[PDB]
C-alpha cells in the first residue's frame, strides 16, 4: 500500500534520478543487482521501503520508476551503468531525436510519438500497486523534453489517474550551467501548462546548488554530478517519511496539508543543512541547534530569494538521524527569538516537526561529509515568487522582440500560447502578493 511511482523526464530528470536511486539503495541496503539481504519477505511485503521498491520472486527489489528521454544517450548510461540490473528494460524508454531545447517539440512534434508508450509503461507499474498514492515527476524547466514532454505527461496523467497526487521536483535554470537561450521561454510555458495538474512542486535553483557546492564544499567548478549528489540528499530528506517508518515520523502528505493553502500556492521553499566537507566535519559535531540555525541562512536555500522580504504561510522541519524532540524544541525556541520570521495573519505560526531516526548516508567518493544528523526545512513563503519574477523578466525582454519565437511557431505553436502563459505567471505573482496582505 501507499506506493509512489517516480517519473524522470529528460537529461536533468534522468541524471537526478540516477543519484536518487543510488542513494535509496545505499539507505536501504539494496545491492546493485537488486538483492536486499535484510529483507526476509521474499517476493513482496508491506514494508515502508516497498512504497518505492517492488519485489520479484527472485528477491530483486525494483524501483517503481520510469525513465523517459527523447534522445537515448543519457538513458544509455543507465542501461550500461553500475545499477543496470536494478531496472527492467521496459522502465527505460528512449527516442532517437530530442526536443532541441524547444518546448513545442517536447510537448507536440516529438513527444506525441512516444507519449502513449510512456503511459503504457506507467500503467504497468500502477497495476502492481495495491494502493497507489501518486507520482513524483523529476524534470528540468529549461530543456525541451523536461519542459514540453513533462507538461504533456502531466496533462495525460490527470486524465488517466483523476485527482491522484502528482508532485514535481523542478530544475530552475541558472546561467552557469545553462545550455539554451530560450530556457526562460520553456520555463514559463511548462509552468503555466502544468500549474493546474500539479499538487506540489519543489523547485531546485541550479544557481543556489551551484553556490552551495562552491561555498560549502570548496568545489571550484561544480559539475552536474556535484549538483545531483546534493539534490538527491534533499530529495531523500523529503521522501524519507514515505520510505522509512518511526514513531516520530510524519508523512509527507501531512506536511503537504500545511504547505498548500490554495491550489496555485503549492511551491515550497526547501533549505538543507548541513552541507559540509569531510575536512571540515572531522573537527566539528554539528548539533541540532546548529543545523536548525542554518535552515534560516538564505545561503542554504534551494531557491535564491529573500524570505526576510516576504511572509511565511507554513514552516516544516524534517529531521533525520540522531535527533530527539527536546533538542528540536530548544533550538526552535532560540530561533524564534533571534530570527526574522513573520507569518501572514491568517495562519498559525507554529513549526511542524518530523523526525526520521535512520541517519543520512553518502555515496562513496562524494564530497558531502557523513553526518550524524541533518534537516530539511520546507517553508511556504511569498518570497519564492522572486524566482518567477526573474524568469518573467527574461521572458519579457526576449518576447518583446519575438526573439526565437519562430522556432516555436514553426513546430505548430501560436503566439497566443506565449501571452496566455505569461499572463498566468503575472496572475501567479499577483496571487503571491495577495496572500501576504493582512486581513481586514
Amino acid at each position: 500500500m501507499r506506493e509512489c511511482i517516480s517519473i524522470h523526464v529528460g537529461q536533468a530528470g534522468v541524471q537526478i534520478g540516477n543519484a536518487c536511486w543510488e542513494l535509496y539503495c545505499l539507505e536501504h541496503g539494496i545491492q546493485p543487482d537488486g538483492q536486499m539481504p535484510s529483507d526476509k519477505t521474499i517476493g513482496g511485503g508491506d514494508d515502508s521501503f516497498n512504497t518505492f521498491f517492488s519485489e520479484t520472486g527472485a528477491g530483486k527489489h525494483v524501483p517503481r520508476a520510469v525513465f523517459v528521454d527523447l534522445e537515448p544517450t543519457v538513458i544509455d548510461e543507465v542501461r550500461t551503468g553500475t545499477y543496470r540490473q536494478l531496472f527492467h528494460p521496459e522502465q527505460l524508454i528512449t527516442g532517437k531525436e530530442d526536443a532541441a531545447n524547444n518546448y513545442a517539440r517536447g510537448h507536440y512534434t516529438i513527444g506525441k510519438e512516444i507519449i502513449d508508450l510512456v503511459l503504457d509503461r506507467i500503467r504497468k507499474l500502477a497495476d502492481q500497486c495495491t494502493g497507489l498514492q501518486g507520482f513524483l515527476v523529476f524534470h528540468s524547466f529549461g530543456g525541451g523534453t523536461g519542459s514540453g514532454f513533462t507538461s504533456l505527461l502531466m496533462e495525460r496523467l490527470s486524465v488517466d489517474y483523476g485527482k491522484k497526487s502528482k508532485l514535481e521536483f523542478s530544475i530552475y535554470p541558472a546561467p552557469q550551467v545553462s545550455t539554451a537561450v530560450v530556457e526562460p521561454y520553456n520555463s514559463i510555458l511548462t509552468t503555466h501548462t502544468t500549474l493546474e495538474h500539479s499538487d506540489c512542486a519543489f523547485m531546485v535553483d541550479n544557481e543556489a546548488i551551484y553556490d552551495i557546492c562552491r561555498r560549502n564544499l570548496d568545489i571550484e567548478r561544480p559539475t552536474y554530478t556535484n549538483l545531483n549528489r546534493l539534490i538527491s540528499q534533499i530529495v531523500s530528506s523529503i521522501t524519507a517519511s514515505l520510505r522509512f517508518d518511526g514513531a516520530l515520523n510524519v508523512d509527507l502528505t501531512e506536511f503537504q496539508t500545511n504547505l498548500v493553502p490554495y491550489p496555485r500556492i503549492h511551491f515550497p521553499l526547501a533549505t538543507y543543512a548541513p552541507v559540509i566537507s569531510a575536512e571540515k566535519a572531522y573537527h566539528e559535531q554539528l548539533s541540532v541547534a546548529e543545523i536548525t540555525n542554518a535552515c534560516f541562512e538564505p545561503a542554504n536555500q534551494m531557491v535564491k530569494c529573500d524570505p526576510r522580504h516576504g511572509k511565511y504561510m507554513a514552516c516544516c522541519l524534517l529531521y533525520r538521524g540522531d535527533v530527539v524532540p527536546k533538542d528540536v524544541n530548544a533550538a526552535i525556541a532560540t530561533i524564534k527569538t533571534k530570527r526574522s520570521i513573520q507569518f501572514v495573519d491568517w495562519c498559525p505560526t507554529g513549526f511542524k516537526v518530523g523526525i526520521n531516526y535512520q541517519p543520512p548516508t553518502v555515496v562513496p567518493g562524494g564530497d558531502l561529509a557523513k553526518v550524524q544528523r541533518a534537516v530539511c526545512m520546507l517553508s511556504n513563503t511569498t518570497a519564492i515568487a522572486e524566482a518567477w519574477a526573474r524568469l518573467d523578466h527574461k521572458f519579457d525582454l526576449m518576447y518583446a522582440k519575438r526573439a526565437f519565437v519562430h522556432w516555436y511557431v514553426g513546430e505548430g505553436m501560436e503566439e497566443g500560447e506565449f501571452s496566455e502563459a505569461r499572463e498566468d505567471m503575472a496572475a501567479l505573482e499577483k496571487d503571491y502578493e495577495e496572500v501576504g496582505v493582512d486581513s481586514v
Partner: protein, 67 residues
C-alpha cells in the same frame, strides 16, 4: 442529513469527472490545433519551393525561345 451526505459525494464525483473531461478535451484541441499549424507551415514552405521550380522551367523555356 442522509440525502445531504449523498449530494456531497455526488458533487465530488461530478467535480473530478468534469476535471478529467475538460482536461481531455483541451488537450485534444491543442494537439489538433498544433497538427494543423505545423502542417500549414510545411505546406507554405513547399509551395514557395515549387514556385521556384516552375520559375526554373520558365527560365529554361525563355532561353530556348531566343535561339
Amino acid at each position: 442529513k442522509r440525502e445531504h451526505e449523498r449530494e456531497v459525494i455526488q458533487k465530488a464525483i461530478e467535480e473530478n469527472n468534469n476535471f478529467i473531461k475538460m482536461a481531455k478535451e483541451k488537450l485534444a484541441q491543442k494537439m489538433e490545433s498544433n497538427k494543423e499549424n505545423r502542417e500549414a507551415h510545411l505546406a507554405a514552405m513547399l509551395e514557395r519551393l515549387q514556385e521556384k521550380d516552375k520559375h526554373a522551367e520558365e527560365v529554361r523555356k525563355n532561353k530556348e525561345l531566343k535561339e
